[PDB]
Design a protein around this ligand. Structure first.
Ligand code: SF4
Ligand SMILES: [Zn+2]
Lengths: 69, 1041, 142, 442
């Protein structure tokens, strides 16, 4: 549970980072790829975590996914 | 029966407040230079006086002090008065006044002589000592003095002149209540037997008694003369900069008339908090911490706040235009805020709903975290703030159960209480109030989103701080816009009560104070006692101008006219015995006899005459002043004068009160009926075609202070001329100040029923209108959907401005047809209800309770807690299901596309108002058939299927072979619809960004009362569905080359 | 070559049709320039021998002109009385030829458009078969 | 020019019939390449907010404007973000502009309890003397004041302002600069004259007799039906035809479009048999109301689509013809800017949009746009040789040069339904010549 909790916290911090742009309506992998395309050099740990937990909506979905914005 | 229980509850509250109010055992105990109050100069109390404006006055019990040239340096339990206020330069001033004790009066029993007086005193001194009742708390003597004076009762007309009375002065305030009661039981006095004494003015507060005796009105200027006081240099019991001790016979009061009408530079602090509670649970003080506290301080008079501050937990990003501090641990945050409140030392504290949710939560959290020094907020050192519970209930403003926080030395003005007690609105939430008063709809944020932002990075916390600062600043904008403080100061200056009493006690205290002030001149006591023919209208649509005649304060003018007052009343069967002549008194229709001014002038006529003179002077001086501040002050003054003059009768006529009398109310109502009848007959008599006039005028509407007449002319100028001439002619026969004046003219007049009329307003220009006036709000209840109000407003505008009843009928038909075809948006049909009472508090099950329970069973996170407002709409369900079971959350309906019960809306929201409006126009009964009984009132009307033939398709094309040649025609029918959605989409989301106040940042507004919130989601879903539908046709072309 | 002359004579006199150039080109199935030359020959030869001939021949004038400081190009249809002024106004004259012949004088240009549009709609499959510009890239696809 | 080349051949139609007749051939297009890929979208999704299309835009302009600063105020000024500023310190700040106006329409007012509120009919420019300008980067907002023109600029502009923060919180501005033109690759030269015809706003379905006669004359001239031998020879060099938006009439949008579409199909059948035709959808054409408007569906054109010369393209028609790059729109951005700015001349507006390096700067604040998240395709990657926009009341043409030796031609094509004028663009000397048709009436 500790590893999963730490990984969830890391992904949430990545979602709440302000220097990559908004984080509503796009999956985290798309946001990370867009950040890399512009040369901002997003962290590789987030990409590895996303790639090691495929299909689970707790990871791919953005932070404000559940709420009806 | 609410009035009697309210009086009992207020009496119990006063009795509780009196007990243990003696703060003698209650005492148990990195700075910016901008905060400090200006430094006091070198002051010598032997040459210069002290001048300051006092805000609040209260009393505490303690040992006596050596005031120079005054009381001896004793330690007896004598009352001490305190006055907190502001000097000219801004120094807070706290003043101590000594040597004042409460007193009351009793009538002289037969055969009483001076020699018994002292003996009586002894017996009374024996009473409280012998009587264990009173808490068994006594030190020395119980009665300080017994004196004999000459007074006459104000109730009735005896005509025997002044009579002896006994004035009894006791040491302590709280001892007034017990001894008075004993005086009703009779006291054994040797020689005199066991006589009884009727109480007189035994239920008057000590502060009010001092204000009446020394002639000091609330929020007025005081001067302590040089050499008459003493200045404390050590052991200041309070936190103020100047403490002065002065006897009560030297404090000079300056009435606020002329150069002494200015307002000192008060300090107003608006404060707010933000907390991070658990998911789906209303915040609680035990476990949920407080993260942000925002404050704005403003010197009164300046147009901008002079201090912004935002204290947040954890490090925060800097803000331009304010100051941000970061505290690691919450205890330091709370203690720092307490130190800030002590050092800044504001004199008015405000916010929004701070009396019920902010201060109790902060104090409970401080107690839980074991921060001992937070509660010390009052100006008195060592006074722990105490939370109490109380309630205020009325059949019009509802029931409120609120906590009250005691802060001695500061005045709290919670805007929610002021709005509740001075306005009537559909919704009292902050967002709705802001939208209604300033036109700006503010952003709403869920608590889970705030909790998520708390764990974010520095910029997110900065955004939260900015939101909290804006929310705390809005009440200051409301206070400046409505000028609440100026009106409050004007009321406190006119009615002679301190500023705080305007928000804790009823209407009777003001009239009691004014009556005592007026009666003290003539030496008249106040004994304590225990508790129409409206003109028939003609509903319809008058397409000719209608003239309006108004009575200027009919009831007070009638009271002034015929000498109606407490002292002018005659006991039945007394005039013959007293030898009065038949031309001295008048006989009211209800059978009461009142003497004219030739014998005695009553208190009420003099008070009302003084009020009218003051209003006339204020109106005269308004036209010449150019300074906006003095214009606001004079406007407040005239408004307060008018309100007090109106409320005099409201006091007098109350069945339950401190001095009820139904004879005056009956006489006033009879005179009103008689005068209205006389006006109607005279108006009918004058304007006749016999006297050469074109048309016969007649009165069509009449009630109290409103007569609406028809003169048969079609030109507005002639209507106004005839109205003014009629006003003068009628006022030339009504004796005494009672007058009737022209008010306005409505050309298109729609008279629904009594107290229900509408028209177009013509006030100044006979050719150009001003607005659309309409009484009888009708669509005012919060449970009525906005659709009803919109339809009523549209119908009224079409009937009045467009003057096309057919157009209004067509619009109503179109609206009904759209409603019956599921075309009207859901946002218009939302009904919101508050969980005011607990689920077990309802006699029967209701819709919102079941909806809240089901939402909680679905997901606790989004489930509203008790006390919040839940929205719902009536969904279509099977017959036999309970009525409360048809409610559902609008978002759930939007997600599942559930059917809406249209019949309930049709026959329970639009039938009654439309029928009431259109009965005078199209006639009773026929209008029902025209509106909701007819063809328009009915308007009768997974695999891929062809849109044309509606058949199952073997393939996945748009149409089958049978509908092939028409395929093109279908395409133009589809894309043209999609376009009509896309534009709307582009006009919705961008709008929210303007509402948010930023472009690049995300949108987190989830307000449930903004129709855009529902509309944007519906538009998004419709766009997705339409794109999926249009993909069935062939693709427009390649996209990979 | 009096056959088409008599055909046009019967078209104008008896049937009272509005004879443009496209209409005659489609009816007789000839090249457009040859149709214009036929119309010009008929117009010129009619007046020598006939003292009446209430024609309302309308010409087409095109060329260059100066408008708002620009070397604009003008193409217009004008009647037989305004020809001299339009010739004078245009600096350079490029094309001048007979455009329309009809016996009934026309207040406006509506009938010409209606006639040309009707005959165009009647023969869609061969819209540009008789034009003076023929392209090889535009081959219909079945 | 057109007249000079037309007058070479002698007049032959004012003579008796002749045995022979001239017959020319259409000039084949040597090269062509459609490059509207960024403006052509496949599966469309609308589950995002507009904020994305702003943020990326800023991050796509910051590396440009900074360079421009070095060419105006020297290298002694360093770009400082808003949160790093200090009072009374001269600095340069790069960001977007927001123009607060009182007359900007709001859905909330039109939908709230006010409803009518004395409804305001649509009108001209919504500019007001009380408009304010707020500079904004990703983090903070700040009001502007100083030597800046409030009315001229519009929302969505990205600029670098030099100035300082005053004690009241506002920003005093001394000078502002724009991103200017993009790098350009010079086009290869030609050998013989070629022409491209630009038409816009046919307005079918209006019923106007003069407009219909003008359309008929244009169709006959382009296809070589009408004109003497010299005119036909000179018009045989027109290698393309572009019809840019507003094809139908105002009242054909709800309908009665079933007749206007048939008329348009017949006209396109007439044109496609003699010259390639490129159709760009407009505001009143049957398509969606985003700014990138997908091509008209071929099912609506049963007859014209039978050929292969006809082509339907996206709204911004970025193409390459004979090594010369063309970029055009339908005129919505120009109209929106003209309605939200104090400028009058449409050609000036077009040049201004060229000098901000953005096709539609007001989008998406007042003009509907698809909510992109990956990239914003409106920014020019390479400066086009020819820039044109249709549906303007006055025909215009102008040649401009950038600071780095550019050469751009701006053409404002007149609304053909009103003025009955089209444009000929040369491809050798890059000259623009108007050509108008008219019919008599009395
Ligand atoms: S985002 Fe829209 S719905 Fe939400 S508060 Fe702002 S204006 Fe109202
Ligand atoms: Zn079918």
């Amino acid at each position: 549970r500790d590893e999963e909790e730490a990984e969830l916290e890391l992904l949430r911090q990545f979602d709440l980072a302000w220097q990559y742009g908004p984080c509503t309506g796009i999956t985290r992998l798309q946001r990370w790829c867009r950040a890399k395309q512009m040369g901002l050099e997003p962290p590789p740990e987030v990409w590895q975590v996303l790639k090691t937990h495929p299909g689970d909506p707790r990871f791919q979905c953005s932070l404000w996914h559940l709420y009806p914005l | 029966a609410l009035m009697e229980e309210m009086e009992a509850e207020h009496r119990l509250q006063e009795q509780e407040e009196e007990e243990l109010q003696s703060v003698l055992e209650g005492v148990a105990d990195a700075i910016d230079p901008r905060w400090l109050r200006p430094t006091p100069p070198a002051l010598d109390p032997q040459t210069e006086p002290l001048i300051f404006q006092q805000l609040e006055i209260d009393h505490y019990v303690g040992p006596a002090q050596p005031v120079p040239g005054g009381p001896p340096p004793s330690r007896g339990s004598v009352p001490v008065l305190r006055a907190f206020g502001v000097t000219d330069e801004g120094f807070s001033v706290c003043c101590h006044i000594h040597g004042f004790a409460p007193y009351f009066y009793t009538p002289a029993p037969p055969g009483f002589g001076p020699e018994h007086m002292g003996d009586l005193q002894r017996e009374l001194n024996l009473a409280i000592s012998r009587d264990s009742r009173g808490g068994r708390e006594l030190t020395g003597p119980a009665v300080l003095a017994v004196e004999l004076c000459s007074r006459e009762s104000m109730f009735g007309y005896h005509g025997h002149g002044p009579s002896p009375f006994l004035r009894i002065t006791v040491a302590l305030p709280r001892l007034v209540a017990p001894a008075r009661r004993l005086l009703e039981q009779g006291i054994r006095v040797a020689g005199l037997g066991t006589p009884s004494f009727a109480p007189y003015e035994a239920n008057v507060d000590f502060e009010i008694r001092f204000m009446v005796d020394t002639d000091i009105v609330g929020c007025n200027w005081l001067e302590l003369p040089a050499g008459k006081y003493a200045l404390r240099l050590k052991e200041k019991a309070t936190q103020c900069q100047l403490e002065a001790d002065v006897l009560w016979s030297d404090v000079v009061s300056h009435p606020p008339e002329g150069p002494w009408q200015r307002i000192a530079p008060l300090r107003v602090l608006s404060f707010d908090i933000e907390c991070a509670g658990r998911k789906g649970i209303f915040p609680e003080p035990e476990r949920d911490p407080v993260i942000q506290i925002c404050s704005l301080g403003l010197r009164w008079g300046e147009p901008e706040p002079f201090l912004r501050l935002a204290l947040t937990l954890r490090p925060c990003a800097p803000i331009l235009g304010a100051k941000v501090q970061s505290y690691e641990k919450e205890e330091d945050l709370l203690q720092a805020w307490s130190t800030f409140i002590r050092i800044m030392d504001p004199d008015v504290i405000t916010g929004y709903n701070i009396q019920n949710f902010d201060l109790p939560y902060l104090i409970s959290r401080a107690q839980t975290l074991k921060v001992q020094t937070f509660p010390f907020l009052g100006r008195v050192a060592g006074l722990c703030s105490n939370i109490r519970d109380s309630s205020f209930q009325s059949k019009q403003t509802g029931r409120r159960d609120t906590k009250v926080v005691s802060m001695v030395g500061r005045v709290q003005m919670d805007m929610l209480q002021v709005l509740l007690r001075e306005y009537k609105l559909r919704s009292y939430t902050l967002n709705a109030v802001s939208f209604h008063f300033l036109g700006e709809q503010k952003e709403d944020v869920q608590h889970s989103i705030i909790t998520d932002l708390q764990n974010g990075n520095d910029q997110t916390r900065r955004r939260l701080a900015v939101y909290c600062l804006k929310d705390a600043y809005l009440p200051l904008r409301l206070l400046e816009r409505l000028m609440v403080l100026v009106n409050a100061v004007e009321m406190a200056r006119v009615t002679g009560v301190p500023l705080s009493y305007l928000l804790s006690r009823g209407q009777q205290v003001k009239v009691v104070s004014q009556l005592l002030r007026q009666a003290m001149h003539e030496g008249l006591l106040m004994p304590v006692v225990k508790s129409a023919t409206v003109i028939e209208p003609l509903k319809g649509y008058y397409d000719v101008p209608i003239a309006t005649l108004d009575f200027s304060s009919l009831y007070p003018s009638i009271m002034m006219a015929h000498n109606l007052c407490y002292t002018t009343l005659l006991r039945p069967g007394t005039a013959q015995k007293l030898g009065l002549t038949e031309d001295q008194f008048i006989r009211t229709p209800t059978g009461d006899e009142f003497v004219k001014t030739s014998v005695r002038k009553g208190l009420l006529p003099q008070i009302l005459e003084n009020l009218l003179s003051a209003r006339k002077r204020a109106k005269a001086e308004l036209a010449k002043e150019t300074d906006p501040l003095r214009r606001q002050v004079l406007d407040g003054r005239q408004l307060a004068l008018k309100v007090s003059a109106n409320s005099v009768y409201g006091f007098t006529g109350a069945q339950v009160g401190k001095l009820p009398c139904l004879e005056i109310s009956q006489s006033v109502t009879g005179f009103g009926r008689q005068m209205i009848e006389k006006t109607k007959q005279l108006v009918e008599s004058k304007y006749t075609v016999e006297n050469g006039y074109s048309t016969s005028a007649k009165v069509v509407y009449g009630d109290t202070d409103s007569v609406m007449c028809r003169f048969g002319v079609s030109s507005v100028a002639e209507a106004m001329a005839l109205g003014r001439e009629a006003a003068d002619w009628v006022s030339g026969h009504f004796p005494s100040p009672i007058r009737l004046e022209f008010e306005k003219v409505y050309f298109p007049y729609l008279l629904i029923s009594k107290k229900r009329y509408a028209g177009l307003l013509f006030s100044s220009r006979p050719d150009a209108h001003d607005r659309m006036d309409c009484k009888g709000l009708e669509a005012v209840r919060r449970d009525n959907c906005p659709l009803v109000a919109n339809l009523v407003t549209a119908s009224l505008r079409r009937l009045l401005i467009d003057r096309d009843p057919e157009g209004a009928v067509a619009h109503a038909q179109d609206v009904i047809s759209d409603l019956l075809c599921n075309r009207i948006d859901i946002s218009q049909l939302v009904i919101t209800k508050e969980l005011t009472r607990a689920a077990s508090d309802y006699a029967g099950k209701q819709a919102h309770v079941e909806l809240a329970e089901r939402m909680r069973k679905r997901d606790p996170g989004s489930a509203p807690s008790l006390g919040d407002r839940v929205p719902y709409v009536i969904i279509s369900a099977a017959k036999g299901v309970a009525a409360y079971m048809k409610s559902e959350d609008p978002l759930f309906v939007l997600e599942h596309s559930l059917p809406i019960d249209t019949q309930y809306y049709l026959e329970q929201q639009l039938a009654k108002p439309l029928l009431r409006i259109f009965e005078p126009i199209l006639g009773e009964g026929r209008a029902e058939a025209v509106l909701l009984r007819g063809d328009h009132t009915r308007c009768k009307t997974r695999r891929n299927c062809c849109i044309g033939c509606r058949t199952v398709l073997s393939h996945q094309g748009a149409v089958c072979e049978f509908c092939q040649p028409r395929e093109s025609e279908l395409y133009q029918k589809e894309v043209s619809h999609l376009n009509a959605l896309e534009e709307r989409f582009s006009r919705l989301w961008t709008q929210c960004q303007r509402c948010q106040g930023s472009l690049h940042e995300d949108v987190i507004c989830t307000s449930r009362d903004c129709p855009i919130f529902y509309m944007r989601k519906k538009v998004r879903k419709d766009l997705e569905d339409q794109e999926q539908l249009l993909r069935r046709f062939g693709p427009p072309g390649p996209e990979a080359w | 070559d009096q056959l088409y002359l008599e055909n046009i004579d019967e078209f104008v006199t008896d049937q009272n049709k509005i004879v443009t150039y496209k209409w005659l080109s489609y009816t007789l199935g000839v090249h457009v320039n040859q149709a214009k030359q036929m119309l010009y020959d008929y117009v010129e030869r009619k007046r020598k021998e006939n003292s009446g001939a209430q024609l309302h021949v309308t010409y087409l004038v095109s060329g260059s002109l100066i408008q708002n400081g620009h070397s604009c190009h003008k193409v217009a249809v004008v009647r037989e009385d305004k020809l001299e002024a339009v010739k004078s106004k245009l600096a350079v004259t490029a094309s001048i030829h007979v455009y329309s012949i009809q016996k009934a004088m026309l207040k406006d240009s509506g009938p010409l458009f209606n006639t040309d549009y009707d005959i165009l709609k009647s023969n869609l499959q061969n819209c540009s078969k008789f034009s003076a510009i023929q392209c090889a890239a535009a081959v219909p696809r079945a | 020019m057109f007249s000079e080349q037309a007058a070479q051949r002698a007049h032959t139609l004012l003579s008796p019939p002749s045995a022979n007749n001239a017959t020319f051939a259409r000039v084949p297009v040597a090269t062509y390449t459609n490059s509207s890929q960024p403006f052509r979208l496949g599966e469309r999704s609308f589950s995002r907010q507009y904020a994305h299309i702003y943020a990326t835009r800023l991050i796509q302009m910051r590396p440009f404007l900074e360079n421009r600063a070095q060419q105006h105020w020297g290298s002694g000024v360093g770009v400082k973000k808003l949160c790093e500023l200090q009072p009374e310190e001269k600095c340069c700040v790069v960001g977007t502009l927001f123009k607060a106006m009182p007359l900007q329409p709001s859905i909330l007012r039109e939908v709230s309890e006010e409803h009518n509120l004395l409804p305001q009919p649509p009108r001209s420019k919504y500019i007001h003397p009380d408009d304010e300008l707020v500079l904004e980067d990703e983090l903070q907002r700040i009001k502007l004041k100083g030597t800046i023109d409030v009315s001229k600029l519009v929302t969505g502009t990205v600029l670098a302002v030099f100035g300082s923060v005053r004690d009241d919180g506002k920003f005093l501005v001394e000078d502002y600069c724009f991103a200017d033109l993009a790098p350009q690759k010079p086009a290869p030269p030609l050998d013989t004259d070629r022409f491209v015809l630009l038409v816009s706003g046919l307005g079918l379905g209006g019923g106007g007799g003069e407009s219909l006669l003008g359309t008929q004359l244009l169709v006959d001239v382009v296809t070589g039906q009408l004109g003497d031998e010299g005119e036909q020879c000179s018009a045989a060099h027109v290698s393309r035809v572009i019809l840019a938006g507003n094809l139908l009439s105002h009242s054909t949008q709800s309908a009665a479009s079933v007749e206007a579409v048939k008329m348009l199909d017949e006209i396109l059948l007439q044109l496609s048999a003699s010259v390639p035709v490129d159709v760009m959808p407009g505001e009143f054409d049957p398509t969606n109301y985003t700014l990138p408007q997908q091509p008209l569906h071929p099912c609506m054109f049963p007859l014209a689509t039978a050929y292969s010369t006809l082509q339907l393209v996206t709204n911004p028609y970025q193409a390459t013809i004979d090594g010369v790059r063309f970029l055009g729109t339908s005129g919505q951005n120009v109209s929106d800017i003209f309605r939200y700015s104090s400028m009058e001349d449409h050609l000036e507006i077009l040049e201004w949009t060229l000098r901000v390096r953005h096709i539609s700067p007001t989008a998406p604040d007042t003009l509907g746009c698809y909510p992109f998240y990956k990239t914003d395709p409106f920014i020019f990657p390479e400066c086009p040789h020819v820039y044109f926009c249709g549906n303007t009341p006055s025909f215009g043409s102008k040649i401009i040069r950038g600071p780095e030796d550019q050469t751009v031609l701006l053409v404002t094509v007149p609304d053909f339904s009103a003025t009955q004028t089209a444009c000929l663009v040369n491809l050798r000397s890059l000259a623009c010549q108007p050509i108008s048709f008219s019919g008599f009436g009395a």
